[PDB]
Design a protein around this ligand. Structure first.
Ligand code: HEM
Length: 404
C-alpha cells in the first residue's frame, strides 16, 4: 500500500476495509486532516463520497439534518447504500424520526437507569466470578459478548436464561442468504416474526401489571405510545438491539486493550478507582466503535471551502475527528483523567445522537468497578484479530489472562 504521508491526495481512499483490518487507516486520516480535511473521493467500491475528517466539520454535518439527510430513500446512514418492511428510525428525517425517538428516550432518564444498577452489577459479578484465573481465554467471547447480551436482557427485562435469542435476532437483522447466518429470506422473515411474537407476549403480560423499570413495561404504560403499531414496536426493538450490540461489545474489549498498552493509566486507575467515571468516555473515544456515519446532501452547501453538491454522499469519520488535535489535546494518548472526557464524537451529535449512550456508559462503569475489585491485571496475550469493516471498529477475538 502507498505511504499516506506523501502519496497523491486524490489516490487516498479511506473506505477500504482492509485499512481498518490492519489498523493503518489512521495514518491516511492524519494526512487528510492536515492537507485536505474535507476530502472528495471520485471513485471507490462504494461510489464517490466526501470524507469529513475534522471534529468541528463533522459536528456541523451531524447537526445540520435539513442539509445532510439520513433518509433510507437516499441510501441511509452507512457509506454502503442500503437494500419485511419495518421503520428504521436512524434512517429517517424529521418529522417522523422525532416521535419514534421520543417513544424510547425513557432509557435516557438517569432516574430510570439508576433503578437498573443492582441488576447490572449482580449480572456482571457472576460472569467475572466465573472466569479462569491465570489461564488464557477469549475476552471477546467470555466477557464482551456475554456482558452485552446481559445489558440488552436488562433493558427489556428479557427472560434471562433465553437472552441468546437477542443476539440471534441481532445477527438475523443484518444477514443475507449465502452468509451462513440465514439460509433464505423466508427464514430471516420467519425469525424476525418470532421476535415480534415474543416481544408481543412480553408486552401483553406487562401492559396490565404495575410497570417495571424495563423498556417494554415503560412503552406499554406510556400514553405517548397509544398509536404505536406493531411494525414500529418491532422496528424500535431491533434498532435498539443492533445499536447496542456491537458498539458496547467493542468498547468492552477496547478498554482492556487500551489499559494493557498504557499500564501507567492502569496504575492510576487502581490507585484511584473513582477514575472509572472519566475513564469510560475515554475508552469510547479511543475505540470509536462506529468509525463513521453517513449522510446524503439534499441542497448545495459550503464546508471547509468546498462545495458539497445536492445528491453527494457525505461521510462523517468519527474515528478521525476523535483524533483531531485542534479540539482534543494529545488525541493519540489514552488518558483516563481528562478534564472533559465526554468531548468526543463516538455518539454523534444532533437529532440522531446515540439514544443509548447513558446505558452503555453505566454498563461499562459497573464492568470496570467490578474488574477492579477482583483482578490486579488483565494481560493481553496476543494482538487481537480486528474486524474487516469501515463501519465497525472492533475485535472478533482477543486472548487474555486475568491475575488475582
Ligand atoms: C459505546 C456504545 C455506543 C456507541 C459508540 C454508539 C454509537 C452511535 C452512533 C455513532 C449513533 C448515530 C449518531 C449520529 O448519527 O449522530 C448512534 C445512534 C443510536 N444508537 Fe448508539 N451507540 C452505542 C450504544 C448504544 C446502545 C447501548 C443502544 C441501545 C440501548 C444504542 C442505540 C442507538 C439508537 C436507537 C440510535 C439511533 C438514534 C436516532 O436515530 O435518533 N446505542 N449510536
Amino acid at each position: 500500500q502507498s505511504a499516506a504521508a506523501t502519496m497523491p491526495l486524490d489516490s487516498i481512499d479511506v473506505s477500504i476495509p482492509e485499512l481498518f483490518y490492519n489498523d493503518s487507516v489512521g495514518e491516511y486520516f492524519k494526512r487528510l486532516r492536515k492537507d485536505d480535511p474535507v476530502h472528495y473521493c471520485a471513485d471507490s467500491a462504494f461510489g464517490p463520497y466526501w470524507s469529513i475528517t475534522k471534529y468541528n466539520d463533522i459536528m456541523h454535518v451531524d447537526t445540520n439534518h435539513d442539509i445532510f439527510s439520513s433518509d433510507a430513500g437516499y441510501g441511509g446512514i452507512i457509506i454502503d447504500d442500503g437494500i419485511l418492511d419495518l421503520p428504521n428510525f436512524i434512517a429517517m428525517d424529521r418529522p417522523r424520526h422525532d416521535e419514534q425517538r421520543k417513544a424510547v428516550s425513557p432509557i435516557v432518564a438517569p432516574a430510570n437507569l439508576a433503578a437498573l444498577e443492582g441488576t447490572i452489577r449482580e449480572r456482571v459479578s457472576k460472569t467475572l466470578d466465573g472466569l479462569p484465573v491465570g489461564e488464557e481465554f477469549d475476552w471477546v467471547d467470555r466477557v464482551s459478548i456475554e456482558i452485552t447480551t446481559q445489558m440488552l436482557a436488562t433493558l427489556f427485562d428479557f427472560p434471562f436464561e433465553e437472552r441468546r435469542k437477542l443476539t440471534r435476532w441481532s445477527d438475523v437483522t443484518t444477514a443475507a442468504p449465502g452468509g451462513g447466518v440465514v439460509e433464505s429470506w423466508d427464514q430471516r422473515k420467519t425469525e424476525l416474526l418470532e421476535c415480534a411474537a415474543y416481544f408481543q407476549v412480553l408486552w401483553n403480560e406487562r401492559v396490565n401489571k404495575d410497570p417495571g423499570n424495563d423498556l417494554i413495561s415503560m412503552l406499554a404504560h406510556s400514553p405517548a405510545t397509544r398509536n404505536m403499531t406493531p411494525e414500529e414496536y418491532l422496528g424500535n426493538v431491533l434498532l435498539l438491539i443492533v445499536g447496542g450490540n456491537d458498539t458496547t461489545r467493542n468498547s468492552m474489549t477496547g478498554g482492556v486493550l487500551a489499559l494493557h498498552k498504557n499500564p501507567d493509566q492502569f496504575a492510576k486507575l487502581k490507585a484511584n478507582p473513582a477514575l472509572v467515571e472519566t475513564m469510560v468516555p475515554e475508552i469510547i473515544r479511543w475505540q470509536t466503535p462506529l468509525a463513521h456515519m453517513r449522510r446524503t446532501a439534499i441542497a448545495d452547501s459550503e464546508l471547509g471551502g468546498k462545495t458539497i453538491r445536492k445528491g453527494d454522499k457525505v461521510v462523517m469519520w468519527y474515528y478521525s475527528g476523535n483524533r483531531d488535535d485542534e479540539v482534543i489535546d494529545r488525541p493519540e494518548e489514552f488518558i483516563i483523567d481528562r478534564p472533559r472526557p465526554r468531548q468526543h464524537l463516538s455518539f454523534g451529535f444532533g437529532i440522531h445522537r446515540c439514544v443509548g449512550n447513558r446505558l452503555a456508559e453505566m454498563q461499562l462503569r459497573i464492568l470496570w468497578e467490578e474488574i477492579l475489585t477482583r483482578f490486579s491485571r488483565i494481560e493481553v496475550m496476543a494482538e487481537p484479530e480486528r474486524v474487516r469493516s469501515n463501519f465497525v471498529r472492533g475485535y472478533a477475538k482477543m486472548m487474555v489472562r486475568v491475575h488475582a
